[PDB]
């Protein structure tokens, strides 16, 4: 089971537009954003108090250099693929997710995945240990990267050794924030329109992201008729979600919502209270 | 620790 | 080969509209618009109270999912009322017209 995760999302665009710099690299610990580089500011900077108070100057400085290097590599990568796919100019995007997970058995998973204009380009995983090309333009990259095993050795040492060592440092630094449990505030709402009552069970303000939200109809579970929203983010670092159902107005009182969360003394039960 | 620079395609 | 590749079909955004907390009249709250599923990453977003732009709009960081689809959280302080219509209006390349998503009040 995954216990902790360190990952970075890189977004590089060929054409800056409002609210999209040329390059942004963001770091997450257990999903929580904690560090950021962008081509406007030109510096790695802390997004949490805990990494600010635990980091030193050389931490920010050393990562600035890689962010600057990555920015320039992506500019070159964007021109390479445009020329390779003989594409139109204008807006193109290279995305990269990479990082590691620490499992309950003490073991490490890691990977690096790149995307181009919304599809798989090339990917790497510690399980298989070789670059996978999604199409024939990526095959050219795969061949160059596999030469003398050089890039696969750097990726492996980073994802298998450096990444989990730094994850363990950050888990310490962030222990308080990471460990906390705020339970949901649950409410059921009811729009009784078109002859057809719609019933929504909303869980507000919960951390972490794991939650069970299930509609009941008498003694039955009602998934067949249930629709769930995503588990989506609040501005304050907590989560929101909802399970919905359609009911006849007459039978509205047969239905109740069950919600379990780690911050819960016990599983809770909720109904429409007009 | 963001020290895995992108490699050019 | 002599091949000329076309960018590929855009994906139109999906929009979830939700408050931080259950609406209570006169109690300050946060209206969220979570925009997902879209390619390419350019969107225009407005948060409207009776068709008028709500003051203090904040937009979060651009991220993306396993399918490389972009997502963004846009949010603003508000006081929910029964009389007023709160909408998230979203424009994208793939969309011939901008589209409004109404906050269904959770009073
Ligand atoms: Cl990952
Ligand atoms: Mg895609």
Author numbering:
A (entry chain A): 2 to 275
B (entry chain F): 1 to 9
C (entry chain B): -2 to 104
Wording from the paper:
Here we set out to determine the structural properties of Acar3, the most highly expressed MHC-I molecule from a long-distance migratory songbird, the great reed warbler Acrocephalus arundinaceus (Acar). MHC-I molecules are expressed on all nucleated cells and are central in adaptive immune responses towards intracellular pathogens, such as viruses and intracellular bacteria. MHC-I molecules present antigens to CD8+ T-cells, and if the antigen is pathogen-derived, the cell will be killed, whereas cells only displaying self-antigens are left untouched. Six distinct pockets (A-F), previously identified in human HLAs, are present in the Acar3 peptide-binding groove (PBG), which is created by the α1 and α2 subunits with their α-helices lining the sides, and the shared β-sheet that forms the bottom of the crevice.
From this assay, the three top-ranked peptides with respect to half-lives of Acar3 complexes, i.e. peptide 1 (AMSAQAAAF, “P1”; T½ = 11.3 h), peptide 2 (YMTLQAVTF, “P2”; T½ = 11.2 h) and peptide 3 (MTMITPPTF; “P3”; T½ = 10.3 h), were selected for further studies. High-quality crystal structures were obtained for P2 and P3 in space group P212121 at resolutions of 2.15 Å and 2.25 Å, respectively. Comparing the binding modes of peptides P2 and P3 within the Acar3 PBG, it is evident that the five residues at positions 5-9 are well aligned in both structures, whereas their conformations differ substantially among their first four amino acids. The Met anchor at position 2 of P2 is placed in pocket B of the Acar3 PBG. Simultaneously, the N-terminal Tyr1 residue is accommodated in the aromatic/hydrophobic environment created by the residues of pocket A. The N-terminus and the carbonyl oxygen of residue 1 establish hydrogen bonds with the three conserved Tyr residues (Tyr9, Tyr159, Tyr171) in pocket A. The side chain of Gln64 was found to play a prominent role in facilitating the unusual arrangement of P3 in the Acar3 PBG. While in the P2 structure Gln64 forms a hydrogen bond with the peptide-nitrogen of Met2, Gln64 creates a hydrogen bond with the carbonyl oxygen of M1 in the P3 complex. Following the conformational differences in the N-terminal segment, both peptides align starting from their residues at position 5. This convergence is facilitated through hydrogen-bonding interactions of the backbone-carbonyl oxygens of Leu4 in P2 and Ile4 in P3 with the guanidinium group of Arg97 which ascends from the bottom of the PBG. Residues Val7 (P2) and Pro7 (P3) are located in pocket E, and the backbone-nitrogen atom Val7 participates in water-bridged hydrogen bonds with Glu113/Gln156 (bottom row). In both Acar3-peptide complexes, the aromatic side chain of Phe9 is deeply buried in pocket F with the backbone-NH and the carboxy terminus oriented towards the opening of the PBG.
